[PDB]
Amino acid sequence: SMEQVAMELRLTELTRLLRSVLDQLQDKDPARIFAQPVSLKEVPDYLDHIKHPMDFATMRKRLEAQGYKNLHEFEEDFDLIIDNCMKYNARDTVFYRAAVRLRDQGGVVLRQARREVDSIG
């Protein structure tokens, strides 16, 4: 139907916007600490600690399968990245400190993307 197509053009444009947002947030991780899933070969106990792992590559697979229906769902996945890190790693570590910075620096990008999604519909 024509309705289903118009929905599909909206999803596709939300996907285009979320891709730009993802690229912006990932630039705020120049050390690539959050680029890829935590290795289970190298951190075998990780799933005992963290029940829903998340990372930028995994967000990217979902993004390109148009798996985010709205900005909220996308934000949930980003927060998992940060929140998982801040639990598993202690305060005085490069990893925790890199999350705090990604959180603080991402906030601006996310502030504006919420306005653009509301605005553009």
UniProtKB/Swiss-Prot annotation:
Cross-link Glycyl lysine isopeptide (Lys-Gly) (interchain with G-Cter in SUMO2) per UniProt, renumbered positions: K41
Lineage top rank: taxon: Eukaryota
Location within or outside the cell: Nucleus; Chromosome
Organs and tissues of expression: Highly expressed in testis.
Boundaries of every Bromo domain copy: 9-113
Subunit description: Component of some HBO1 complex composed of KAT7/HBO1, MEAF6, ING4 and BRD1/BRPF2. Component of the MOZ/MORF complex composed at least of ING5, KAT6A, KAT6B, MEAF6 and one of BRPF1, BRD1/BRPF2 and BRPF3. Interacts (via PHD-type zinc finger domain) with unmodified histone H3. Interacts (via PWWP domain) with dimethylated and trimethylated 'Lys-79' on histone H3.
Role summary: Scaffold subunit of various histone acetyltransferase (HAT) complexes, such as the MOZ/MORF and HBO1 complexes, that acts as a regulator of hematopoiesis. Plays a key role in HBO1 complex by directing KAT7/HBO1 specificity towards histone H3 'Lys-14' acetylation (H3K14ac), thereby promoting erythroid differentiation.
Stated name of the protein: Bromodomain-containing protein 1
Originating organism: Homo sapiens
Gene: BRD1
Residues of the full protein shown: 555 to 674 of 1058
